[PDB]
Design an enzyme around this catalytic site. Structure first.
Site, PDB file in Angstrom:
ATOM      1  CB  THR B   1      -0.936  -0.015   1.257  1.00  0.00           C
ATOM      2  OG1 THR B   1      -0.440   0.866   2.278  1.00  0.00           O
ATOM      3  CG2 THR B   1      -1.016  -1.422   1.827  1.00  0.00           C
ATOM      4  CE  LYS B  33      -4.883   0.369   0.524  1.00  0.00           C
ATOM      5  NZ  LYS B  33      -3.557  -0.155   0.131  1.00  0.00           N
ATOM      6  N   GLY B  45      -5.162   8.836   6.959  1.00  0.00           N
ATOM      7  CA  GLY B  45      -4.968   7.742   6.026  1.00  0.00           C
ATOM      8  C   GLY B  45      -4.405   6.620   6.875  1.00  0.00           C
ATOM      9  CB  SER B 124       5.324  -1.731   0.614  1.00  0.00           C
ATOM     10  OG  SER B 124       4.164  -1.608  -0.178  1.00  0.00           O
TER      11      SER B 124
END
Ligand SMILES: Nc1ncnc2c1ncn2[C@@H]1O[C@H](COP(=O)(O)OP(=O)(O)O)[C@@H](O)[C@H]1O
Lengths: 408, 174
Positions: B1, B33, B45, B124
């Site tokens: 994500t 998100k 978020g 990531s």
């Protein structure tokens, strides 16, 4: 407590009692003296004791009334004991300490009721929030803008505005409660619920005591009935006994109340007598000393009677008018009607036994027995009690003596 | 994500992608998100469980109710329980939160972190977004929103765990 001058006290007392100006001043000096004491220093405050009064006069002429209004005017604990009540204790009976107990059980039945007055707005303000919390269960942890929990006062304002009578809607709240109920109950169950939290113990019961000690007023009726009379001897020591028994109370002592330890050193005593058989100097030495103030009250006259009927605040005549209004009836007394009611009362008191102003209540009350009954079926009328009406209803009764001893 | 937050010219944003991965395959492609909190004043978020969210964001809201809009503090008070309360502990995630005041990251470790220029890039795909965001922020007049967007795309292009579905929450104030 009150900062009223003697003159102002008498004035205030003039709103309930007709005549008897002297007794008014005597009792007024006493009250003001309690104020005069607190304005002093340490020493002089122990030394200065109440100037107890001995009211001298015939039946029902305003002795107790004066003392009752005096007490009531200083929001002081008041007790009225009949002296002979203890003359039979030489055989068995109430101890004189009971006087200070009652002046306490009533000095409490007073501080309590007057805690329901002060705490009658608390349960219907910072306590009605209970039903509104189950009406619109507040935010999960209100935010905080000192006007945020006041913002609703839209949704919130509606539940309160509609809560101006609209209820009987069963809900529930919280030994808190939890139990499911209504509102003609959930709400009232809250009335006392949230109120017993503002009133505490060791201050309420502690204050009732502070009252009696500082503002207590004891009225010892018929003190003359416990004086020595030249008819026997055994009963005299019995009488004089009540005098010795009362001595500690007006000389200064400690009595045991189930609310605490009361000190009588500053309780004001108003003794009362007719003194037709005995004279105040027949009272024991120690008691005459403790009764420094002597004041006489005169017998009431027909004019005093006319004035007592209409002048006092909430006079029997005014009350009557009020009560008949309840029935939607307009009662009205003409001057001569009253002049005659008083006249009648005077007649019966002279022809039979004199009971003072009391006679007015019975005469007045017999006079109205008919309207009092029919009042409900007379709604919307203007009844006038005038000299004529008065005569038609009272003459025959007053005229017949044996009948007066029964009916009037 | 990949979560990206930027702040320029009285404008702050948080943008995220929508890929949820399990092993070597995509479970879902449109995961929201980036939400909103404290009566739509505070944006956020996150990277983690949809529940961990609906628990860490609810709490955060109440923490603000206990500290008059003051972001930072509620944030401090938040990461506080998140590392103490026996239960709350097992919760795993990376909240990115930003109000008109400031922006910052919160980790289960209890840390409250304010990155260099209110620039945030977690997940990531985080660094690739940072690299592109930084580039743009230093060599162009583009807007906070335009940044996060473009940056997010760059990320999803490099990161095998980041897609091109977005969810942005802006904020204006000046
Ligand atoms: N001077 C007065 N002024 C007003 N009411 C009086 C007066 N004298 C007597 N009364 C009325 O008569 C009743 C007699 O009782 P009270 O006045 O206590 O006198 P006492 O203690 O001498 O019997 C009272 O209820 C009171 O209303």
């Amino acid at each position: 407590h009150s900062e009223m001058t003697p003159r102002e006290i008498v004035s205030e007392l003039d709103k309930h009692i007709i005549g008897q100006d002297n007794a008014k001043r005597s009792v007024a000096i006493a009250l003001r003296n309690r104020w005069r004491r607190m304005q002093l220093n340490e020493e002089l405050r122990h030394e200065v004791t109440p100037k107890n009064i001995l009211m001298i006069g015939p039946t029902g002429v305003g002795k107790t009334e004066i003392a009752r209004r005096l007490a009531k005017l200083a929001n002081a604990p008041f007790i009225k004991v009949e002296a002979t009540k203890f003359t039979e204790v030489g055989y068995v009976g109430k101890e004189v300490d009971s006087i200070i107990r009652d002046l306490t059980d009533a000095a409490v039945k007073m501080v309590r009721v007057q805690a329901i007055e002060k705490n009658r707005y608390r349960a219907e303000e910072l306590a009605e929030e209970r039903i509104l919390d189950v009406l619109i269960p507040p935010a999960k942890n209100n935010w905080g803008q000192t006007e945020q929990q006041q913002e609703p006062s839209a949704a919130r304002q509606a539940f309160r505005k509609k809560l101006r009578e609209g209820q009987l809607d069963d809900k529930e709240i919280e030994k808190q409660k939890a139990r499911k109920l209504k509102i003609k109950d959930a709400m009232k169950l809250l009335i006392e619920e949230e109120a017993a939290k503002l009133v505490n113990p060791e201050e309420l019961k502690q204050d009732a005591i502070d009252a009696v000690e500082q503002h207590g007023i004891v009225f010892i009726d018929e003190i003359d009935k416990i004086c020595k009379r030249g008819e026997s001897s055994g009963p005299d020591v019995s009488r004089e006994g009540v005098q010795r028994d009362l001595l500690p109370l007006v000389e200064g002592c400690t009595v045991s109340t189930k609310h605490g330890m009361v000190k009588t050193d500053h309780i004001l005593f108003i003794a009362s007598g007719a003194f037709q058989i005995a004279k105040p100097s027949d009272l024991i030495p120690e008691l005459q000393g403790r009764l420094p103030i002597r004041v006489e009250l005169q017998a009431l006259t027909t004019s005093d009677f006319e004035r007592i009927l209409t002048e006092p605040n909430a006079s029997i005549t005014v009350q009557y008018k009020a009560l008949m209004a309840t029935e939607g009836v307009n009662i009205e007394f003409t001057d001569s009607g009253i002049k005659r009611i008083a006249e009648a009362a005077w007649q019966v008191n002279e022809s039979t036994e004199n009971i003072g102003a009391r006679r007015l209540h019975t005469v007045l009350e017999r006079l109205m027995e008919e309207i009092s009954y029919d009042a409900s079926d007379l709604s919307g009328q203007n009844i006038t009690i005038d000299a004529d009406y008065v005569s038609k209803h009272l003459d025959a009764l007053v005229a017949d003596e044996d009948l007066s001893r029964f009916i009037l | 994500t990949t979560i990206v937050s930027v702040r320029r010219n009285g404008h702050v944003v948080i943008a995220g992608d929508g890929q949820a991965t399990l092993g070597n395959t995509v479970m879902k492609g449109n995961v929201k998100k980036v939400r909103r909190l404290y009566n739509d004043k505070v944006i956020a978020g996150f990277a983690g469980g949809t529940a961990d969210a609906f628990t860490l964001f609810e709490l955060f809201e109440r923490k603000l109710e206990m500290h008059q809009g003051h972001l930072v503090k509620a944030a401090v008070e938040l990461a506080k329980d998140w590392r103490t309360d026996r239960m709350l502990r097992k919760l795993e995630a990376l909240l990115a939160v930003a109000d008109e005041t400031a922006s910052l990251i919160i980790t289960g470790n209890g840390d409250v972190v304010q990155p260099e220029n209110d620039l945030i890039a977690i997940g990531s795909g985080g660094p690739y977004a940072q690299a592109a965001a930084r580039a743009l922020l230093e060599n162009t007049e583009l807007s906070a929103r335009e940044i996060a967007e473009k940056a997010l795309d760059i990320a999803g292009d490099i990161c095998i765990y980041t897609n091109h579905f977005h969810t942005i929450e802006e904020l204006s104030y000046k």
